[PDB]
């Protein structure tokens, strides 16, 4: 009711109990995941995935597994806008990198363009 409020940023790493080593050490990455190109389906777009950097993964000497001393290794954070993505990355204290979304460029194709008269565009095989 028009109360106390100050206008400042947020530093939630004092609250969430995380080690400051894993705060100042690592660095987030915010990106739209590129389409797995062997498939052709663009539903895997329309997100904003936040990952962390990959780190040390040695081998289990007894079996031949993959062991790591990395607690923040296998997270991913699905967001829906870059604005609140960068806002959250600022808000929870860690540093971050911002890649940029690259759309499929629209084109101009026709079967009639494939079957021209003098133009060298000619499929010659179908």
């Amino acid at each position: 009711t028009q109360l106390i409020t100050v206008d400042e940023k947020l530093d939630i790493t004092t609250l969430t109990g995380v080690p400051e080593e894993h705060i100042k050490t690592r660095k987030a990455r915010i990106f739209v995941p590129a389409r797995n190109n062997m498939q052709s389906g663009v539903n895997n777009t329309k997100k904003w995935k936040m990952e962390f950097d990959t780190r040390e993964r040695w081998e289990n000497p007894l079996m031949g597994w993959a062991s790591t001393a990395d607690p923040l290794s296998n997270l991913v954070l699905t967001f829906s806008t870059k604005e609140d993505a960068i806002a959250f990355a600022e808000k929870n204290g860690w540093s971050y990198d911002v890649e940029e979304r690259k759309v499929p460029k629209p084109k101009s194709k026709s079967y009639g363009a494939n079957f021209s008269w003098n133009k060298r565009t000619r499929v010659s095989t179908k």
């Binding site: 109360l3 409020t5 206008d7 609250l15 050490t25």
Partner: protein, 114 residues
């Protein structure tokens, strides 16, 4: 940006509540080190307590400082009861080195640590 407070009006009442909390922690140590049959002198534990208070020293929002006061209040109630045990109080200490320094040469002999 009318945002609700928790308890205080600025950082000053927050300083008052946290110095009350620090007084309670300071006169709350010797009963704990007498009760739990511990292993460490009184002044060393008090120094790590005041070091923990020194750790969060760059917080300016009143809600966050009030919430840390609430966290310390909850932990102080649990330590002044006998709900916690020897393992938790030793878990506040960090004696299980891991002596891993910030020396770039020592960061180089055991590495991959940006």
């Amino acid at each position: 940006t009318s945002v609700k407070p928790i308890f205080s009006r600025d950082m000053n009442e927050a300083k008052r509540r946290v110095r009350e909390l620090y007084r309670a922690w300071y006169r709350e140590v010797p009963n704990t080190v007498h009760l739990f049959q511990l292993d460490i002198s009184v002044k060393q534990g008090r120094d790590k307590v005041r070091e923990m208070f020194k750790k969060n020293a760059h917080v300016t929002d009143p809600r966050v400082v009030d919430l840390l006061v609430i966290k310390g209040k909850m932990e102080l109630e649990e330590t002044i009861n006998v709900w916690k045990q020897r393992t938790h109080v030793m878990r506040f200490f960090h004696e299980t080195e891991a002596p891993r320094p910030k020396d770039f040469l020592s960061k180089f002999y055991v590495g991959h640590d940006p």
